[PDB]
Structure formats: structure tokens, C-alpha cells
Design a protein around this nucleic acid. Structure first.
Ligand SMILES: [Mg+2]
Ligand SMILES: [Mg+2]
Ligand SMILES: [Mg+2]
Ligand SMILES: [Mg+2]
Ligand SMILES: [Mg+2]
Ligand SMILES: [Mg+2]
Ligand SMILES: [Mg+2]
Ligand SMILES: [Mg+2]
Ligand SMILES: [Mg+2]
Ligand SMILES: [Mg+2]
Ligand SMILES: [Mg+2]
Ligand SMILES: [Mg+2]
Ligand SMILES: [Mg+2]
Ligand SMILES: [Mg+2]
Ligand SMILES: [Mg+2]
Ligand SMILES: [Mg+2]
Ligand SMILES: [Mg+2]
Ligand SMILES: [Mg+2]
Ligand SMILES: [Mg+2]
Ligand SMILES: [Mg+2]
Ligand SMILES: [Mg+2]
Ligand SMILES: [Mg+2]
Ligand SMILES: [Mg+2]
Ligand SMILES: [Mg+2]
Ligand SMILES: [Mg+2]
Ligand SMILES: [Mg+2]
Ligand SMILES: [Mg+2]
Ligand SMILES: [Mg+2]
Ligand SMILES: [Mg+2]
Ligand SMILES: [Mg+2]
Ligand SMILES: [Mg+2]
Lengths: 233, 56, 252, 121
RNA sequence: UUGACAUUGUGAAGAGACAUAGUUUCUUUACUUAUUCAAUGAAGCGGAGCUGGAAUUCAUUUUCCACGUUCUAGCAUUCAAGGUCCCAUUCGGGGCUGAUCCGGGUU
RNA sequence: GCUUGUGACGGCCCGUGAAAAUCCACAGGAAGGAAUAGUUUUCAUGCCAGGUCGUACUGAUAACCGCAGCAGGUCUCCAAG
RNA sequence: GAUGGGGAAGCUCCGUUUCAAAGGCCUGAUUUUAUGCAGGCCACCAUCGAAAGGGAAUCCGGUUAAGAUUCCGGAACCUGG
């Protein structure tokens, strides 16, 4: 309205150099970026066999949250807690004549791959959590089959570091439970039942189902509309 | 010689009219008339094809 | 025996192109947004002689649609284009001499030069002075465009392939006798060390299949098979026929 | 929330923290003393007769000078070692791999005097 | 140069066997992720929506095109002026809009 | 007049007869800038500094290569009656 | 002719902007204080290669046994600060 003025610009072809736009879709990313992205795509364009891709069926966040809820009540000893336990049991044992039992029987989540494997073999685990990320998937693939044969209820859970946080490691391939104070027995079977329903009962059916073969949407839309018109003309 | 133009005052390297040391003052006369006439005909081009849109 | 002449050329020591004075590489613009959705305007700022080349080149400057700057291309001058002309380049572009249009967007009978083999290769076919291609039909499904090349061959390429309307300047250049060695000398002086040519029949046998003998003669059939091996191929390679071509040429 | 917004199409090397050096042991345990002191910059007077003439006529001292020394290091090493103002210094390499300085003093200083004050004659 | 095997994976029609149930093998022709070729300071791809309109309506749209630049050897740059909302009003500065959404497959 | 320099032209080409450093100008208008006093270093004048290596001589029927102070070979400027 | 690379048993061969996360300037921010970060650019991508190519700027007189557009004298010019 003052000496100010409206002067709209004409960004049509042949005039008015294009403005700056969000070229995020076009940037020439570093190869390491490119590789991991196309690795995910190549891993989806193939037909993946059913002994893999029984993964990608990750436990739901709610059931998982309740599983992290219970499992946190059973962390292993911290740094200071063990040195604290020692001097408490180095004193009371060596003089008070405690039968190497000036400390109560511990209750914690069991972890470490080879540890957890033999626990399942020996039928001592009550609930095995398997991460969905393990990069040499062979370290883990045989666990749904193993738990199934051993009557051990298992669950594939998003987060190999999230299993690691609850055991004071940066990461952890697995996390399992064998011992549980009687105050938490009921919450366990409650979780185990939901968990068996999602995985250990669906095993044999998932064992027959391949996965993958999923097109990108440029070749998908070229498919949804090519079979759209060809049939319903 | 080109390095010597740095040892000489600006009046030796320009003339007072627009596009001084750059264009030959008959080209300036031309890029003036061309500019003015095109901006004029450009206005003519719009209201002619505006009336086209109102009657077609 | 020795390594024969045509074998030495591939090493490219004294046989590489004599390139110093060349104007640049003649190329259509990069097939960007403007050219394949609309059209873009430029001015041929100059048409100029390219050393060692038959046809004159056309320097054609455009605006950069993405940065405030002028970007200049090197076209081959199609006959009739001139300094100061406005060249349009795009899918939707007028069918006027000098403009560059996707083969799909010109009627049959159009006569274009510097045409792309696949779309975007910035100019492959019909570049030498006096040549052109003619479009002889279209297949809108698969959007091919059948053309006829200067050889007579009839290739079929994409309708997106780009060509420039008209024929290439400098025609008839090959109707004048060189008239004398020096003209040919200065000719090849600015192309490459291909001239003059000692006949293989004037060398000793170390040098060439045709070499030696107490009279000057080829000694065996000069038609050499495709399957011949390097150092054998000299003469009429894979000749499907031979002798003075009498009767009308012109592919059926 | 949502993604980054890169207006440019080129990815470039992120500008990362480039840390200075905090060595845990020293470099060479003792810094080397001055490799070209004044007493090393000027090695001998040149008392050739053609040079002695430049002392008497042109008010110039001729010195054999370290090859490593430049025109600056001569001018400085002359003032410090002889308490004189140097106008300008011309040098040349003798044809036996030695440097000759033609050192000219300002009009205040008489070269001839400063020449038998250092001793040669 | 020609063949076989390996790199070699996904469909569909058509041949081939236990002797006219689908495991498997080929011929024909599709698919894209291996592999291959090109282009670009990986810039506007694919899908959908806006508004116009050819279109004839067989109930209301069943669709298909479009969907800022062509008398002239000018000029086109400061995240854009305009519009709108903020900072607590300074001089400065930001968001949105201008420039429609969605998928991150550079084409 | 002679040698050389240069100009405006003209002949020739299927030959149309390098590159980069570097220097300037223009288009642009970001910004900064005075009344009780500012902007100005492309105007004049004034201050300081400018390193490192080569620099002699021969260049030829004797200083180079031809076993040599070899009738050979070896790039070029100046040029009186 | 290095370099991310690609060959090759290997000495090494190939590629030179080459399928690479390739780099640095202007000044603002500081008034702990020195240079961290706040803008915006540039995506130009080694280097070697001409004592006849390109190229900042000097002259005259005098002077030595032997040096000089280099010393002396007088008169300039360029570049950087
Ligand atoms: Mg041989
Ligand atoms: Mg070459
Ligand atoms: Mg030759
Ligand atoms: Mg011949
Ligand atoms: Mg011949
Ligand atoms: Mg012979
Ligand atoms: Mg032979
Ligand atoms: Mg033979
Ligand atoms: Mg013969
Ligand atoms: Mg004969
Ligand atoms: Mg010197
Ligand atoms: Mg085959
Ligand atoms: Mg691209
Ligand atoms: Mg001459
Ligand atoms: Mg000319
Ligand atoms: Mg100039
Ligand atoms: Mg000045
Ligand atoms: Mg320096
Ligand atoms: Mg001399
Ligand atoms: Mg002599
Ligand atoms: Mg001799
Ligand atoms: Mg190399
Ligand atoms: Mg150099
Ligand atoms: Mg030079
Ligand atoms: Mg030179
Ligand atoms: Mg003299
Ligand atoms: Mg002397
Ligand atoms: Mg002399
Ligand atoms: Mg002097
Ligand atoms: Mg003076
Ligand atoms: Mg100055």
C-alpha cells in the first residue's frame, strides 16, 4: 500500500531463475549411505526364505514395554554393587562363619549368546528374548527353532541395544529369564502367554511362508494401474 | 597494456554515460530503445490476451 | 616379420588427432527440465570455423535456469542459421530451421541433423558438412521414430531423441578437386597423420602382406575375411562383392 | 519430526573438530642454538688490493660471508659486530664457493677508519 | 568364433514324465534387484490433487487432454516483492504464504 | 634510396592461422555515510621496504662436438661508399 | 605425473576429475579472549613442464688490468606495507 509493491515472480520455463527448493530427494549421498539403503532394498526385492523373515515379525511395542517393565526388575549387579557385596560377604563370611552365604541368591536376567543357548537346551529358560537386528543373522536364526523344540517360549524383540541397555552392555544379541522371585511369577505367565500366541504358536505357519518380492512404488504404481485398466476396461 | 591499467586513474578507463568503458554508445542507444520498446510491447501482449480470455 | 602400418595406429603415438586449434566439442544442450517439458530460448552469438572440420560451428548461449549466469553451448551450424537468431530447444517448440526438437514431435518428412542415438547423448548422427536424417514414420506406442541416415541405413530410435531442424552448413565441399598434393597436405595436417599412403605393394614383405615379388602384385586374393587376425586384415576386409559398381545404387 | 532440508544437491565433507597437538613427550629435548649468529654470518675481511681500494675510495667494506647468509643477515651482522650504519649490501658468489659482501656505509662512517679499527691493513 | 557349465534371480502362456493330480525340464515374453551402458556441480521423477476445457451425459461424471516464456542481437542474481503471523518494538531477525499434497527410486 | 617499425587496405585457404597466469571496466546496489560538521586514498604530495640463484670469457679454420689448436659439423641480432 | 580408486604373483600397470564424504576466502561474532562459531558465498579438485611463447617496473654519462642496463653520479619507474 505504501511505496511498497507487489511484483509476483514467474518461475515458468525460460524466465526468473528457479528459487531454492528442497532437493533432499536428489542429493548425491556418500557411498556408505548409498550402500546401506540399497542393501535394505535388495533385501526386500528378493524372495526371502521362511527361516529368515520369521523375523520382521517383531513383538509389538506394548507387549514389549511390559517385557522391559518386568526385565528391568532383574538387572545384573552394577560396578559398585558387586564390590559392595564382596566386602559385605568378605567380612561376614571370613569371620561370622557364613557358609559362603552372607549374600542372598541373586536373581537377574541371563544373557550372552552361548550362555542362553545351553540354558534353552537344558530346559532352564522360562522366556527368551531375541533381537531382530543381529547382522550375522546366523548367530540367532536357529533360536526360534530351538526354543520351539524345547518348549521354551521365545519372542523376537526390536532392539539389540535395547536388550543391551537392560544388561549394561552397549548391545546384546539375546536376553532370557530362568529365575523369578515369586512376586513376579504371575506377571510372567501373563507375558509368556501373549508372547507364545504371537510367536511360538505361529511358528509352524510362519515356517511355510516366504517373504519379500516387494516392488518399489515406481514399479508398483506401474503395476496397480496396468492391471487396473487391462482388466476393468 | 593490461597490467598498466592499474597505474592510471579511473577517468582513463571509462566515459561518463552508462556502460562507460564497456559498450560503444551506439549499442547503448540500441539496448535502450530495444529495452523500452520490448517493455512497451510486453504490456500490449498482456491486455490483448486478457481480452482473448474474456471473449473466445 | 614386421608390425604392419594399420597395426601401429592403435597405439596412438603419432596417429592421435591434431587437436590444438579445435573450437571444442559440438553438443546439443544437456536434456534438462526445460527441454523435455517446454522449450528454452538462446541466441547464436557467433558461427565459426572449427579447424579440421568440414562444417562451421554455432556458438549458442542460453540462460541457466537454476543459477543467474549465461551458459554457452557449441552447436553445429545448420545451413541458414545466422548471428543473432533465436534458437528454441524443447518438446513444445516451433518447427523452424535451427531449433532442436524431440524426434517424436516433428511430422514425417522433417529434415534434421546432429540427432541423438539414444535420448540425451547430445548428438550422434548426421554431423558432417552436408548431411542430415529424414524421419520416415512413427510408432506412438513405444514412441519410436523411424529415420533414414546419410548412409541410407534406416535406424529406429526413441521419439525423445533430439535433432536440430535443417541440414548442416558447408555442403558441396567435396565437389572441388584438391587439385594438388599440398591441398591434401594442409587438409590432413589439421586432422591426423594419415597422409600420404605408401602402398603395401611397394614395401618388402616384412612390412605388409602385399610386399615383395619381382613384379608389383598382390599375389593372393585381396579380400580378407572378418575372422582374419591382426596383421592379416589389409585390402578389402570382409568384402561381400567387388569390382566396378555398375547399375543404379540407392537401397530399395 | 521430519527430515533435514538440503537446498543443495552436493554432499560435502562435514566440518569436523580439528584438534591441536598436546604432545606427551618433547620434540628434541633441547632447542638448537642460533644456527647463524653474527660471528658466523661474516667470516673474514677481504683484503685484496682491489678490495682495499673500495675501502679507501668508495667507503665500502668487503667481507667473506657465509653462503647461508642473505642480504639482510649481512646488514644486521655488520651493525652488531662493528657499530656502523649500512647503506646497502651487494653480494656475489666468488668462483670458489664463498660469498663476497660489498657493504657500503652511510656518509657518517668512514670505512677506511673502521677498517684499521678492526685491524686489517 | 561356436557350445556347455558357473555368475542366474521372479512371473505367465506353450511343450515335456511317475503312466489326463504338479515336483521338474526346455521353447516363446514379461518382471527388476544381480549384471551392463549413458547423463548430471545426482533439479524438478513417479503417483495424486487443483483449477480450465474438448468431450455426451443414459444419473452424476464413465473419461481423455492440457494445467505461466516466440515480431526485436535489451533486462532476469542478494533465502523475493507482496500478504500474513511472531520478537516485545530499534536498528535488526524469524515462520508461514508466494511456489498443492504424497513416496526419499538422481534420471 | 637502404634497414627496420607501423598503419589503412587488398590476395589466399576442404589450411581461416595457441593456452594460462595476470590487469582493468561495466552491469548490479549490499551496505556505510554530513551541519555544527562527515564520507572520501582510482587527484597531489609525503614514509618504509624489495630477498634467493646466474652475471668472467670463448661461441669457433684454437676456448663446443668431431681421439687433436682436425679444410668437417654446430641456433641467431646489428650491417657504410 | 601424485591422489580415492581399478589391474597385476610382483617390480609395478591404468585412470587425472577419473563411480571419492576431496577444499578456503571474506568478515561478522569477541570486550572472560583468543579465535570458538553466527551468515553467505566457491565446488575451482594436485603438481611438474618455455633462460626463443605469455610477463610489474631504468635510463643516460662516468668508471676497471679484468665487472657493469648490476659499481659511481644524476635523473626515474614498479610492487608491497
Ligand atoms: Mg612382429
Ligand atoms: Mg588426444
Ligand atoms: Mg606423414
Ligand atoms: Mg599411394
Ligand atoms: Mg592407397
Ligand atoms: Mg621396394
Ligand atoms: Mg608376411
Ligand atoms: Mg596372405
Ligand atoms: Mg607381393
Ligand atoms: Mg601393379
Ligand atoms: Mg646478484
Ligand atoms: Mg546361449
Ligand atoms: Mg540427474
Ligand atoms: Mg629480418
Ligand atoms: Mg582472419
Ligand atoms: Mg580494459
Ligand atoms: Mg594513489
Ligand atoms: Mg616471502
Ligand atoms: Mg659479459
Ligand atoms: Mg678464438
Ligand atoms: Mg675445425
Ligand atoms: Mg600414474
Ligand atoms: Mg611451473
Ligand atoms: Mg619465460
Ligand atoms: Mg618469454
Ligand atoms: Mg657506460
Ligand atoms: Mg672494478
Ligand atoms: Mg667485457
Ligand atoms: Mg645508481
Ligand atoms: Mg636520488
Ligand atoms: Mg604504493
Amino acid at each position: 500500500n505504501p511505496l511498497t509493491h507487489s511484483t509476483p515472480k514467474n518461475f515458468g520455463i525460460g524466465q526468473a531463475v528457479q528459487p531454492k527448493r528442497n532437493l533432499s530427494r536428489y542429493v548425491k549421498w556418500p557411498e556408505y549411505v548409498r550402500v546401506q539403503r540399497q542393501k535394505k532394498i535388495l533385501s526386500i526385492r528378493l524372495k526371502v526364505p521362511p527361516t529368515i523373515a520369521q523375523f520382521q515379525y517383531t513383538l509389538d511395542r506394548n507387549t514389549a514395554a511390559e517385557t522391559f517393565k518386568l526385565f528391568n526388575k532383574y538387572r545384573p549387579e552394577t560396578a559398585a554393587e558387586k564390590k559392595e557385596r564382596l566386602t559385605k560377604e568378605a567380612a561376614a563370611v571370613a569371620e561370622g562363619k557364613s557358609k559362603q552365604d552372607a549374600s542372598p541368591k541373586p536373581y537377574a536376567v541371563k544373557y550372552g549368546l552361548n550362555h542362553v543357548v545351553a540354558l534353552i537346551e537344558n530346559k532352564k529358560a522360562k522366556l527368551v528374548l531375541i533381537a531382530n537386528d543381529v547382522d550375522p543373522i546366523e548367530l540367532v536364526v536357529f533360536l526360534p527353532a530351538l526354543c520351539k523344540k524345547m518348549g521354551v517360549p521365545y519372542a523376537i524383540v526390536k532392539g539389540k541395544a535395547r536388550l543391551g541397555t537392560l544388561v549394561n552392555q552397549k548391545t546384546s544379541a539375546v536376553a532370557a529369564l530362568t529365575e523369578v522371585r515369586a512376586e513376579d511369577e504371575a506377571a510372567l505367565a501373563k507375558l509368556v502367554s501373549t508372547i507364545d500366541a504371537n510367536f511360538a504358536d505361529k511358528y509352524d505357519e510362519v515356517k511355510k511362508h516366504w517373504g519379500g518380492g516387494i516392488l518399489g512404488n515406481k514399479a508398483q504404481a506401474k503395476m496397480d494401474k496396468r492391471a487396473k485398466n487391462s482388466d476393468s476396461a | 597494456r593490461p597490467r598498466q591499467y592499474a597505474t592510471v586513474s579511473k577517468t582513463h578507463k571509462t566515459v561518463s554515460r552508462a556502460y562507460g568503458g564497456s559498450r560503444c554508445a551506439n549499442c547503448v542507444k540500441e539496448r535502450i530503445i530495444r529495452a523500452f520498446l520490448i517493455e512497451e510491447q510486453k504490456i500490449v501482449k498482456k491486455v490483448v490476451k486478457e481480452q482473448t480470455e474474456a471473449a473466445k | 616379420g614386421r608390425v604392419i602400418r594399420n597395426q601401429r595406429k592403435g597405439a596412438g603415438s603419432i596417429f592421435t588427432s591434431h587437436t590444438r586449434l579445435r573450437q571444442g566439442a559440438a553438443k546439443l544442450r544437456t536434456l534438462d527440465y526445460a527441454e523435455r517439458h517446454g522449450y528454452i530460448r538462446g541466441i547464436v552469438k557467433q558461427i565459426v570455423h572449427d579447424s579440421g572440420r568440414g562444417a562451421p560451428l554455432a556458438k549458442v548461449v542460453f540462460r541457466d535456469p537454476y543459477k543467474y549466469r549465461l551458459r554457452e553451448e557449441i552447436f553445429i551450424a545448420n545451413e541458414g542459421v545466422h548471428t543473432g537468431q533465436f534458437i528454441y530447444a524443447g518438446k513444445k517448440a516451433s518447427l523452424n530451421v535451427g531449433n532442436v526438437l524431440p524426434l517424436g514431435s516433428v511430422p514425417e518428412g522433417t529434415i534434421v541433423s546432429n540427432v541423438e542415438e539414444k535420448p540425451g547423448d547430445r548428438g550422434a548422427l548426421a554431423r558432417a558438412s552436408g548431411n542430415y536424417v529424414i524421419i520416415i514414420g512413427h510408432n506412438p506406442d513405444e514412441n519410436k521414430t523411424r529415420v533414414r541416415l546419410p548412409s541410407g541405413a534406416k535406424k529406429v530410435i526413441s521419439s525423445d531423441a533430439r535433432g536440430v531442424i535443417g541440414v548442416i552448413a558447408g555442403g558441396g565441399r567435396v565437389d572441388k578437386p584438391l587439385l594438388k598434393a599440398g591441398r591434401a597436405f594442409h587438409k590432413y595436417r589439421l586432422k591426423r597423420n594419415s597422409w600420404p599412403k605408401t602402398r603395401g605393394v611397394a614395401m618388402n614383405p616384412v612390412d605388409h602382406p602385399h610386399g615383395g615379388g619381382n613384379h608389383q602384385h598382390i599375389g593372393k586374393a585381396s579380400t580378407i575375411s572378418r575372422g582374419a587376425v591382426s596383421g592379416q586384415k589389409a585390402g578389402l576386409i570382409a568384402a561381400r562383392r567387388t569390382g566396378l559398381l555398375r547399375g543404379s545404387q540407392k537401397t530399395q | 519430526k521430519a527430515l533435514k532440508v538440503r537446498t543443495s544437491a552436493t554432499f560435502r565433507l562435514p566440518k569436523t573438530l580439528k584438534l591441536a597437538r598436546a604432545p606427551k613427550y618433547a620434540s628434541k629435548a633441547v632447542p638448537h642454538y642460533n644456527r647463524l649468529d653474527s660471528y658466523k654470518v661474516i667470516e673474514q675481511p677481504i683484503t685484496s688490493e682491489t678490495a682495499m681500494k673500495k675501502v679507501e675510495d668508495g667507503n665500502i667494506l668487503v667481507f667473506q660471508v657465509s653462503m647461508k647468509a642473505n642480504k639482510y643477515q649481512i646488514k644486521k651482522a655488520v651493525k652488531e659486530l662493528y657499530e656502523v650504519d649500512v647503506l646497502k649490501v651487494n653480494t656475489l658468489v666468488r668462483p670458489n664457493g664463498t660469498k663476497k659482501a660489498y657493504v657500503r656505509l652511510t656518509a657518517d662512517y668512514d670505512a677506511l677508519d673502521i677498517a684499521n679499527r678492526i685491524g686489517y691493513i
